[PDB]
Coordinates of C-alpha atoms and ligand atoms in Angstrom, one line a residue:
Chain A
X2 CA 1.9 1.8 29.6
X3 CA 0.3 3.1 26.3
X4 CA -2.3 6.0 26.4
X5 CA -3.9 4.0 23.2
X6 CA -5.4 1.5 26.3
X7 CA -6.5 4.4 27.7
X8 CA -8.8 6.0 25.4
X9 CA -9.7 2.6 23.8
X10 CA -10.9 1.3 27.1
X11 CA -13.3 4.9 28.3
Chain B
X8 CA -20.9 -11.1 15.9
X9 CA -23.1 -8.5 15.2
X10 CA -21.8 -6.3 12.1
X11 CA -21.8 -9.7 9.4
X12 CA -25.5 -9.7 10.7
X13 CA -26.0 -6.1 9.1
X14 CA -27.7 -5.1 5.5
X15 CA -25.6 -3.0 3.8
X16 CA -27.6 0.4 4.1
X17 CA -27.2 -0.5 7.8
X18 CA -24.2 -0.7 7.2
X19 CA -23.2 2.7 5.1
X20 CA -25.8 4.4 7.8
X21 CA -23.7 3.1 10.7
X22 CA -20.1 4.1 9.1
X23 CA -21.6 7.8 8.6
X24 CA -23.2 8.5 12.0
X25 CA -19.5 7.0 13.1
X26 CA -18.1 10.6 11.5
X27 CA -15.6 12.5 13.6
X28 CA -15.7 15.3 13.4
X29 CA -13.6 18.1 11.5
X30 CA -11.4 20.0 13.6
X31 CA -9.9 23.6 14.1
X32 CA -6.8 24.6 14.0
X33 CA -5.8 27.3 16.4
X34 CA -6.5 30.6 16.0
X38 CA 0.6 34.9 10.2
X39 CA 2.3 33.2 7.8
X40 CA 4.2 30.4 8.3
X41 CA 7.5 29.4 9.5
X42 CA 8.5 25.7 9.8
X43 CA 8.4 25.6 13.3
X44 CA 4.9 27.3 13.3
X45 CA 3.2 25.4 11.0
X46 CA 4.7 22.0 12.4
X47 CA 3.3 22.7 15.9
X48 CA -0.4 23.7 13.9
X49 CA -0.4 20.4 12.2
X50 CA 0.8 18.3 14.9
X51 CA -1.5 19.8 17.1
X52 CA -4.2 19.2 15.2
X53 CA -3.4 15.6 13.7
X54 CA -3.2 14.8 17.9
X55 CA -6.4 16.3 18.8
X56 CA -8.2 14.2 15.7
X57 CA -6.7 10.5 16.9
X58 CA -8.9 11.1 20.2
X59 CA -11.7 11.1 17.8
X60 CA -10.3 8.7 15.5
X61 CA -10.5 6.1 18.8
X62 CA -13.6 6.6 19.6
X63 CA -14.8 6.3 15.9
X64 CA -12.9 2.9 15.8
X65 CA -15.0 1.7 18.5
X66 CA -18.1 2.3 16.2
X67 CA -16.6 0.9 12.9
X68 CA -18.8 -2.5 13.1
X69 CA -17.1 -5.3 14.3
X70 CA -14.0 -3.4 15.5
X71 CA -15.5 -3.6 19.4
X72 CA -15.4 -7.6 18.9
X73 CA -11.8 -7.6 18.4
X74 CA -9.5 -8.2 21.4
X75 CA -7.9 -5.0 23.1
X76 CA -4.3 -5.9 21.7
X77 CA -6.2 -6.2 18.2
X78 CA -7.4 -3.0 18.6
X79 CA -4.3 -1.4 19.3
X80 CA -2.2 -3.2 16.4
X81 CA -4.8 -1.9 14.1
X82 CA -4.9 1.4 15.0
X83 CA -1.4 2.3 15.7
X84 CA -0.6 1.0 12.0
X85 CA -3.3 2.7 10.1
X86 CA -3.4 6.2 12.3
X87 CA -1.5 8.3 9.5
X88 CA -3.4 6.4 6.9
X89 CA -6.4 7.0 8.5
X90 CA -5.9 10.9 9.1
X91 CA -4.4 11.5 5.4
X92 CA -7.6 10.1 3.3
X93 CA -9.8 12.0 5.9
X94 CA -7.5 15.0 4.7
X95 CA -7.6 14.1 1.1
X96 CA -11.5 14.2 1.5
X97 CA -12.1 17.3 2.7
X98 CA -9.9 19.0 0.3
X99 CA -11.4 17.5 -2.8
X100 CA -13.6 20.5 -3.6
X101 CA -10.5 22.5 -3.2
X102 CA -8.1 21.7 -6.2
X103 CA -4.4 22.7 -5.2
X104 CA -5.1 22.6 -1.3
X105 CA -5.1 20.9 1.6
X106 CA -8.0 21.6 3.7
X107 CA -6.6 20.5 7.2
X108 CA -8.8 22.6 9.2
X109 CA -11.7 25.0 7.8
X110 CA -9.1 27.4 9.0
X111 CA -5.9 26.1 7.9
X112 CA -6.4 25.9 4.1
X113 CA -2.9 25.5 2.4
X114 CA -1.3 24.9 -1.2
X115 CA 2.0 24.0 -2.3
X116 CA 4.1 26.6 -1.8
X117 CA 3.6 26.7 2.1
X118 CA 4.5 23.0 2.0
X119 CA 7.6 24.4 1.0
X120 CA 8.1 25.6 4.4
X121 CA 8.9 22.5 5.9
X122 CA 11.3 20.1 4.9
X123 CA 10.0 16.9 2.8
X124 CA 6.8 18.1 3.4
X125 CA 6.7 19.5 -0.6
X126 CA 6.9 15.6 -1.8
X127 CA 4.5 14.7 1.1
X128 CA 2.0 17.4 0.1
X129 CA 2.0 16.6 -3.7
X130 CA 1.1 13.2 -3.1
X131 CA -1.6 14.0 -1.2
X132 CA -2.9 16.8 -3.8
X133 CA -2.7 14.0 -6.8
X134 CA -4.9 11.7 -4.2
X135 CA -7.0 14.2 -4.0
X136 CA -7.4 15.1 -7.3
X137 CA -7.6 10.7 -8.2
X138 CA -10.8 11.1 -5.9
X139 CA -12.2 14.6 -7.3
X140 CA -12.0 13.0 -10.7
X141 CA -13.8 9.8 -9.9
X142 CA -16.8 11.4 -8.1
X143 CA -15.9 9.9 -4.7
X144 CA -19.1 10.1 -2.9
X145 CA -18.8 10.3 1.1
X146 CA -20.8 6.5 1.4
X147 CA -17.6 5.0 -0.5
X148 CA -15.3 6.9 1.5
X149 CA -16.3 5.9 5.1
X150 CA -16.3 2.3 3.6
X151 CA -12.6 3.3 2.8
X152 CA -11.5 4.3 5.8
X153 CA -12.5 1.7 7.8
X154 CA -10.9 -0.7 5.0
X155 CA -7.8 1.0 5.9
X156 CA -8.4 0.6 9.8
X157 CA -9.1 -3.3 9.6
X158 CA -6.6 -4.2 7.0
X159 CA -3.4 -2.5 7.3
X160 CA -2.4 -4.7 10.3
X161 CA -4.0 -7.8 9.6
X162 CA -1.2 -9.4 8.1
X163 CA 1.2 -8.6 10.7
X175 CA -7.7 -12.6 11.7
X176 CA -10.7 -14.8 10.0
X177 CA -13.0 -13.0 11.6
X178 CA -11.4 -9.4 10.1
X179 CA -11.7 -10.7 6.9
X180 CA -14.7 -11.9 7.2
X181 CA -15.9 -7.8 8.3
X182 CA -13.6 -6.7 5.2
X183 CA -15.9 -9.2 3.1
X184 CA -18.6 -7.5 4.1
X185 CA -17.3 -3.9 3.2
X186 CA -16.9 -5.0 -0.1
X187 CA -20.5 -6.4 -0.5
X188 CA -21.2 -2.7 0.7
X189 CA -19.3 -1.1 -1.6
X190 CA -20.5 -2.8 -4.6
X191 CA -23.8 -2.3 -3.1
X192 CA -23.3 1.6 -3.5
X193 CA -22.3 1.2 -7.1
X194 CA -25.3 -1.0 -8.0
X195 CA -27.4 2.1 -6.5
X196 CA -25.6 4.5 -8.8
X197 CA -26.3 2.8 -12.2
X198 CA -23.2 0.9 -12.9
X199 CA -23.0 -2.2 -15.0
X200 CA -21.0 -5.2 -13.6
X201 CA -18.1 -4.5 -15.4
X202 CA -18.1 -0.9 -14.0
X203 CA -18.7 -2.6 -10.6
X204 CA -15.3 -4.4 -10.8
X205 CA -13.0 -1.8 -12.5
X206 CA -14.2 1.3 -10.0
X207 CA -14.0 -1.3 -7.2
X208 CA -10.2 -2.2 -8.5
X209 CA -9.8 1.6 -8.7
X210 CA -10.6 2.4 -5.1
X211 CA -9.0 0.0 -3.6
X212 CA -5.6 0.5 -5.5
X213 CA -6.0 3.8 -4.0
X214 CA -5.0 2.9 -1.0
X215 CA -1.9 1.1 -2.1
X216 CA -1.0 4.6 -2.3
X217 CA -2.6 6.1 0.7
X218 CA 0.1 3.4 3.0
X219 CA 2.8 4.7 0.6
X220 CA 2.5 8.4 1.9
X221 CA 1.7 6.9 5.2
X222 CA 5.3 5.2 5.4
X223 CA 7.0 8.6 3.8
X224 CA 5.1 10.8 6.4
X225 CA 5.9 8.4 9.0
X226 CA 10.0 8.9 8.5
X227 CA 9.5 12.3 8.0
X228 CA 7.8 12.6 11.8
X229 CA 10.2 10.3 12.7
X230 CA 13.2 12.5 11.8
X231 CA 11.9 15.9 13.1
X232 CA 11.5 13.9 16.2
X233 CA 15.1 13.8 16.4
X234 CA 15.4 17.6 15.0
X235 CA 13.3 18.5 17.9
X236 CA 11.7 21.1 16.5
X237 CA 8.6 21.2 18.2
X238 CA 7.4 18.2 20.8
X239 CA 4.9 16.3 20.3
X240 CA 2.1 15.0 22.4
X241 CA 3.0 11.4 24.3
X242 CA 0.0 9.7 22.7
X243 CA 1.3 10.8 18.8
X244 CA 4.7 9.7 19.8
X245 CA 3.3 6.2 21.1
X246 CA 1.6 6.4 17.9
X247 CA 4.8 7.1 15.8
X248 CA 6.9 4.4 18.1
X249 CA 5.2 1.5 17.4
X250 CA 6.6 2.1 13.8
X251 CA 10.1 1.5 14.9
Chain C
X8 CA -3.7 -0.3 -29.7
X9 CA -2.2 -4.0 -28.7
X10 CA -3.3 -4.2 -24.9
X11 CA -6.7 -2.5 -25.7
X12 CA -7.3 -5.0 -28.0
X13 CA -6.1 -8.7 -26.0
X14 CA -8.9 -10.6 -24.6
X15 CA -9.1 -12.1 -20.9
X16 CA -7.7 -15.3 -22.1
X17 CA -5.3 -13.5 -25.2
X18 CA -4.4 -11.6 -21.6
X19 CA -3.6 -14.1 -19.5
X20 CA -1.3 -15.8 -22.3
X21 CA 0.8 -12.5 -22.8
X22 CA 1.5 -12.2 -18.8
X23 CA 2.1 -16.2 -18.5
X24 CA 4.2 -16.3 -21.6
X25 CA 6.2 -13.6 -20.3
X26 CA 7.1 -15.1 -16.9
X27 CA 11.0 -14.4 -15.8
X28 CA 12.5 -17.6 -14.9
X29 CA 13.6 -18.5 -11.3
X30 CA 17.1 -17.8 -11.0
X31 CA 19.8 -19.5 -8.9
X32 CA 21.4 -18.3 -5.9
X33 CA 25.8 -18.5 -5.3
X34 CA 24.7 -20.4 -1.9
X35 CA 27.2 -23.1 -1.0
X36 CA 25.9 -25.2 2.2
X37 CA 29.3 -25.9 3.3
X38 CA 29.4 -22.1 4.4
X39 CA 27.1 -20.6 6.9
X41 CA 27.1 -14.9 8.4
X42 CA 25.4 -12.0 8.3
X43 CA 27.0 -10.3 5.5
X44 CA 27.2 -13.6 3.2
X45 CA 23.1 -13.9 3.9
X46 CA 23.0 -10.6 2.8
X47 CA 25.4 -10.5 -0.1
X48 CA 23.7 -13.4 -1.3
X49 CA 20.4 -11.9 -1.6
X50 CA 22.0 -8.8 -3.1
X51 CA 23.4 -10.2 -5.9
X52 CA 20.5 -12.5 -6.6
X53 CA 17.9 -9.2 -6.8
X54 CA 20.5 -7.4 -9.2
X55 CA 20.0 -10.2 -11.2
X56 CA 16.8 -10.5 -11.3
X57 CA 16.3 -7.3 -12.0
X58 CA 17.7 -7.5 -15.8
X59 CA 15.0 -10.2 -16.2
X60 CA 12.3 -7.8 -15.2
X61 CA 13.4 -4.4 -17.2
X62 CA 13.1 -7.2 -20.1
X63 CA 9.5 -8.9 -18.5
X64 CA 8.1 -5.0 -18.2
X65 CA 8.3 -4.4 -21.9
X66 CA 6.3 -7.6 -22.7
X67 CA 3.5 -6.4 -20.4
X68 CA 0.7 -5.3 -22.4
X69 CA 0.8 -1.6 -22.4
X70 CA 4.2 -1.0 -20.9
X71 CA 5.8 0.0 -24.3
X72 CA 3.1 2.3 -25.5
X73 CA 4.0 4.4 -22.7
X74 CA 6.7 7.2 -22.8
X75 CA 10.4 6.0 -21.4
X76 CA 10.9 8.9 -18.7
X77 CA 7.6 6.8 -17.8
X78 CA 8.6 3.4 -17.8
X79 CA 12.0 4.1 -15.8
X80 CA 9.6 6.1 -13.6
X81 CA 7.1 3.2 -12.7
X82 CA 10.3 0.4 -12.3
X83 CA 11.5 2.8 -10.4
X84 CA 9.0 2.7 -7.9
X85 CA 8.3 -1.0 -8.2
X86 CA 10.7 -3.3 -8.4
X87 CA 11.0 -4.3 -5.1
X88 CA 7.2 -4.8 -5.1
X89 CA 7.2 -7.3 -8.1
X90 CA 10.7 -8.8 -6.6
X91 CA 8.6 -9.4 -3.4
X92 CA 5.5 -10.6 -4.5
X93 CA 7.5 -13.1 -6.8
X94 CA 9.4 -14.6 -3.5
X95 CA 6.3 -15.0 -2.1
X96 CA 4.1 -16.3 -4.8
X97 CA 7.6 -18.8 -5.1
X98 CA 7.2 -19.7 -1.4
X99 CA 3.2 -20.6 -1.2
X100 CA 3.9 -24.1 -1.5
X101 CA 6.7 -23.9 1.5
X102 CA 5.2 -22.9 4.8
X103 CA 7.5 -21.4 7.4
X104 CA 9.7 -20.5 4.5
X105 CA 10.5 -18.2 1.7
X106 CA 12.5 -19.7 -1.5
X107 CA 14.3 -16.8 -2.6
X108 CA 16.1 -19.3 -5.2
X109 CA 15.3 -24.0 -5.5
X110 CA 18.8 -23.8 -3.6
X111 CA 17.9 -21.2 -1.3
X112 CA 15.2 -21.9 1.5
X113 CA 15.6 -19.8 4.8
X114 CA 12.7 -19.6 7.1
X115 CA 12.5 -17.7 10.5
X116 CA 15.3 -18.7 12.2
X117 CA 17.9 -18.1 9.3
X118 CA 16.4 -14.6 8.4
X119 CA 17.4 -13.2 11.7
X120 CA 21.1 -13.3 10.7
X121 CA 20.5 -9.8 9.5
X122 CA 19.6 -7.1 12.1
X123 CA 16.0 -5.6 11.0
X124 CA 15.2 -8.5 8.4
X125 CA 13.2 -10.2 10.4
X126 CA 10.1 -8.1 11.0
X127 CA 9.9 -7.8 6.7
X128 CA 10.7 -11.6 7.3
X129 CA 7.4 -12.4 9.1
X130 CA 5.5 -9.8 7.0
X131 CA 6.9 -11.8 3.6
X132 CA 5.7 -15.1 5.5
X133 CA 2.6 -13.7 6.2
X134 CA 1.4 -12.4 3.0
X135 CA 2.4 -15.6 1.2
X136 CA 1.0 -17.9 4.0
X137 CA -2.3 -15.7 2.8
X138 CA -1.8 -16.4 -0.3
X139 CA -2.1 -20.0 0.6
X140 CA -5.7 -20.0 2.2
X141 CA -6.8 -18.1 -0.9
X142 CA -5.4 -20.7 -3.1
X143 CA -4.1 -17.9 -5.5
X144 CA -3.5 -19.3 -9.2
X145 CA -0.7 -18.8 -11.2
X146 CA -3.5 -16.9 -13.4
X147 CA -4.1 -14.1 -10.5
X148 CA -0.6 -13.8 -9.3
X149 CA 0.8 -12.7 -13.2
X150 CA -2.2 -10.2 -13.3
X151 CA -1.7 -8.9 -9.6
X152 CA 2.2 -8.7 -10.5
X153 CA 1.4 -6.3 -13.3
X154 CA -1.0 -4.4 -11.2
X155 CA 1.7 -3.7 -9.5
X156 CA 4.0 -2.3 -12.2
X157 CA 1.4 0.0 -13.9
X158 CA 0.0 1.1 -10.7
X159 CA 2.6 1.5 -7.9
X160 CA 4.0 5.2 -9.8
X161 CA 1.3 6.1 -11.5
X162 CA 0.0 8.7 -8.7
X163 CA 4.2 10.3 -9.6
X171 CA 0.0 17.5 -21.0
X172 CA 0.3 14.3 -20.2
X173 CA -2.4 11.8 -21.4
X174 CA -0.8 8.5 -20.6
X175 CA -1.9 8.1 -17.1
X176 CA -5.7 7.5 -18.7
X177 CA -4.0 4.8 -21.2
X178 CA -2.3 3.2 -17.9
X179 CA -5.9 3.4 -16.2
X180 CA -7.5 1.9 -19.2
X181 CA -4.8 -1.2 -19.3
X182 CA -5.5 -1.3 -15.4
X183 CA -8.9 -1.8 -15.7
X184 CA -8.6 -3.8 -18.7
X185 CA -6.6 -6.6 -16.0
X186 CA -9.5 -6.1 -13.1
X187 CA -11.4 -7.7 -16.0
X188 CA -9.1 -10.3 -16.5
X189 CA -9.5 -11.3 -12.8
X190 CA -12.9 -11.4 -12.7
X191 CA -13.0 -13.4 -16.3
X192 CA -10.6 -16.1 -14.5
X193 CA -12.6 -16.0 -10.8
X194 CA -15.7 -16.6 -13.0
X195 CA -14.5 -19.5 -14.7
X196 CA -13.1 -21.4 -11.3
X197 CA -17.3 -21.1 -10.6
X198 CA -17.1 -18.1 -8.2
X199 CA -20.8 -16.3 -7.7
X200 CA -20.6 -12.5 -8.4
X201 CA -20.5 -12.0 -4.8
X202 CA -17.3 -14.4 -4.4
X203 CA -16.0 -12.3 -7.3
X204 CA -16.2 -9.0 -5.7
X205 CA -14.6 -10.2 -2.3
X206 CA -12.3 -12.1 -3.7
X207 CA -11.1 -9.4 -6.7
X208 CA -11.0 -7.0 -3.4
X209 CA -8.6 -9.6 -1.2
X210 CA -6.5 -9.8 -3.8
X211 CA -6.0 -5.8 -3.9
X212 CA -5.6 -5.4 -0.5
X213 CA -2.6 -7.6 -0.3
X214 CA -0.9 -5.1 -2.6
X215 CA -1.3 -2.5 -0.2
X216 CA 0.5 -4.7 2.5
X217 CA 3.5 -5.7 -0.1
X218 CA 3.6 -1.8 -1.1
X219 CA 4.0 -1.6 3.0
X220 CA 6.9 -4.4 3.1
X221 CA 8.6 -2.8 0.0
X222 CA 8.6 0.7 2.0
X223 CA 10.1 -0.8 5.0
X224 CA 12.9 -3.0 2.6
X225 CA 13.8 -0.2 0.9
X226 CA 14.4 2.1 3.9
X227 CA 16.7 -1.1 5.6
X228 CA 18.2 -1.2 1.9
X229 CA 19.4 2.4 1.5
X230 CA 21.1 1.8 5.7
X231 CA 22.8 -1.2 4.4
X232 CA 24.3 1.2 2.0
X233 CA 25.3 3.4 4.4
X234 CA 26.4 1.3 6.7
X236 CA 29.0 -4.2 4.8
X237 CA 28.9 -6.1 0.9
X238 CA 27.8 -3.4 -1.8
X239 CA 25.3 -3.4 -4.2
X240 CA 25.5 -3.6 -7.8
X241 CA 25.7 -0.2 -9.7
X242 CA 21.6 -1.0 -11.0
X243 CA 20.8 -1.1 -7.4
X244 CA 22.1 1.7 -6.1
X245 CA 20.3 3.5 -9.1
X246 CA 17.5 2.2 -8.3
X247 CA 18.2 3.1 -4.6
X248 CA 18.4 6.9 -5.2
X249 CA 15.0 6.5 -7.0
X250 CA 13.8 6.3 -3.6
X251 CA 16.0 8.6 -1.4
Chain D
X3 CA 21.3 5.5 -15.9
X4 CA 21.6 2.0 -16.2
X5 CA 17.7 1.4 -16.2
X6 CA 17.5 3.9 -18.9
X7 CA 20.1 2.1 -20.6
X8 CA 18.5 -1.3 -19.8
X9 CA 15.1 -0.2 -21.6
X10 CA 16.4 0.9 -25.0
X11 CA 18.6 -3.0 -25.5
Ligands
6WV1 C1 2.8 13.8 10.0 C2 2.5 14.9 9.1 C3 1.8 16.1 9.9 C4 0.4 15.7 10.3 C5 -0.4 15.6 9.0 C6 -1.8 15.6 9.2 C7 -2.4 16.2 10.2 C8 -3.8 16.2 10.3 C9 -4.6 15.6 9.4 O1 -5.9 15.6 9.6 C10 -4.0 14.9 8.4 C11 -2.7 14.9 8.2 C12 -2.1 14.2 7.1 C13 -0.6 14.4 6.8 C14 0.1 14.5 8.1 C15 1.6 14.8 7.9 C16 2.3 13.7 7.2 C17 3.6 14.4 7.1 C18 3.7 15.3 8.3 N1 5.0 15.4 9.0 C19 6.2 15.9 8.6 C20 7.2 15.9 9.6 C21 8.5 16.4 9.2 C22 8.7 16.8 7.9 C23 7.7 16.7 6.9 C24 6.5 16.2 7.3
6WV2 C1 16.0 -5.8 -0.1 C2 16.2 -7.1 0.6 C3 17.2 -8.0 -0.1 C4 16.5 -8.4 -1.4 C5 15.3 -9.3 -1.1 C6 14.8 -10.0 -2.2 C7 15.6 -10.6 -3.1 C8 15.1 -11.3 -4.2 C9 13.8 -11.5 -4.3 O1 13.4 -12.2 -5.3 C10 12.9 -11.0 -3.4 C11 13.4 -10.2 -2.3 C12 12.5 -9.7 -1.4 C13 13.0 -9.2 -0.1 C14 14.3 -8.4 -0.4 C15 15.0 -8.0 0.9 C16 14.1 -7.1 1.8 C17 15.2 -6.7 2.8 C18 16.5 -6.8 2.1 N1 17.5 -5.7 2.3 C19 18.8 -5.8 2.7

């Protein structure tokens, strides 16, 4: 899945 | 929510202490291989702060995660060419992509497209050198560009965009201008950015076809970044 | 010294007065393809464009500049003012877009064509947003000329400030008619910025048809010789 | 060019 999730979510 | 419930100083104050930060780039002159892997590079290390400056834009956190998302992966490029058109307006005829990576036309002529791309971005930066842009206007800019870019593709984004503007004129009340000034340099600002997503959609193809070319690779996140524009 | 010198109302006359009409389409219902969608919408832009060269030069303004100027600025924005005169035509018809009285396609139809639908939904959208704000036909022939004198003008030379000056001239023309429907200054503001921002999502749309525009050229009905023209403008 | 063209008529 998208990295965007990623670093939006931490 | 709590950014409608904000003054508008509280507001400017809260956009500034959001800042990224400005970036190096690494370290000859150029080649077009070279100096697409410098700018790449560094437009991949910024979106990492670019997220995390998002999440501080007020009202951004209240949207849903898939909001989030769809408004940042259309307004990335936006997003990163004003912050690039801001730091080089004290340099007329530059680019100031890093404090070390200072270029002018000519090396944009080492890449191809990038001469059309870079003049744009030199006349934007001249529109803001000549208007006296101050640096409260253009955080409330940017995160104009981050909220409104994907909105149409939502009452509660409009109703933080509203709020922008209330800041905005705010600013130029504290400046000395009439009302009529108020509307017209509004108008002017934010027909700005009609032309900030027009570079935005030329630089996007343009990364689009060198990622065919294959010149250099890019990082997975900037290519997630560049797919969600196909 | 002519668009210097309109007022807001003597402003709004000049724009109104100089309104294209709303041309016909060659749709027959007893025919339903791809290629005759597409033809079809073709020929109808190519013929709407005559009607705007001629609607340009009675934009206050527009004749004072130089030509290389004026081919420069319709170069850059005719599918702008061709798209944000769909949708202004389409406010009243949710779910659809009347590209002509005998030509209503919504959602459905505008998949026929591979890649029209995303600019589909982004058309719908913008005039379905036009539709909460209620835009009058008074804002929409102001924000049309925005478009024209403001879409090129960023591509010796004194006449940009004379463009500026006519540009600023219409923000005041906005705000004169937003004051007179009984908006506060506040409503002004936010409503005068609204209206801006949607040009920034119709200069998106007309990016993304132009770059579907210059494949369907490549790729099968072709384009009148004006459209192609103005196709290079962009490639 | 016909836009040229178009302008001067
Ligand atoms: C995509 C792009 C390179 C990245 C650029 C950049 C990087 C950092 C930054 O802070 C701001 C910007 C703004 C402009 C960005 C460029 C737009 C055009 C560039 N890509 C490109 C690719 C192939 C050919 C020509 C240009
Ligand atoms: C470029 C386009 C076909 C022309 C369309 C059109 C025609 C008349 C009009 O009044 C407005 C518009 C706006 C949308 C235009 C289409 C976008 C995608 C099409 N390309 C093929």
């Amino acid at each position: 899945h998208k990295i965007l999730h990623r670093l939006l979510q931490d | 929510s709590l950014a409608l419930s904000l003054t508008a100083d509280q507001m400017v104050s809260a956009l500034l202490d959001a800042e990224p930060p400005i970036l190096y780039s690494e370290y000859r002159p150029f080649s077009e291989a070279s100096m697409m892997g410098l700018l790449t590079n560094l437009a991949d290390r910024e979106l990492v702060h670019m997220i995390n400056w998002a999440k501080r834009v007020p009202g951004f956190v209240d949207l849903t995660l898939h909001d989030q998302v769809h408004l940042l992966e259309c307004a990335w490029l936006e997003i990163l060419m004003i912050g690039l058109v801001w730091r080089s307006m004290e340099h007329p005829g530059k680019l100031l992509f890093a404090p070390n990576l200072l270029l002018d036309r000519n090396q944009g002529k080492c890449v191809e497209g990038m001469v059309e791309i870079f003049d744009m971005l030199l006349a934007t930066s001249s529109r803001f050198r000549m208007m006296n842009l101050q640096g409260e206007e253009f955080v409330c800019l940017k995160s104009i560009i981050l909220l409104n870019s994907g909105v149409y593709t939502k009452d509660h984004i409009h109703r933080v965009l509203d709020k922008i503007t209330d800041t905005l004129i705010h600013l130029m009340a504290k400046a000395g201008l009439t009302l009529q000034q108020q509307h017209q340099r509004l108008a002017q600002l934010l027909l700005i950015l009609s032309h900030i997503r027009h570079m935005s959609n030329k630089g996007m193809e343009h990364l689009y076809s060198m990622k065919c070319k294959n010149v250099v690779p890019l990082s997975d996140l900037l290519l997630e970044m560049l797919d969600a524009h196909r």
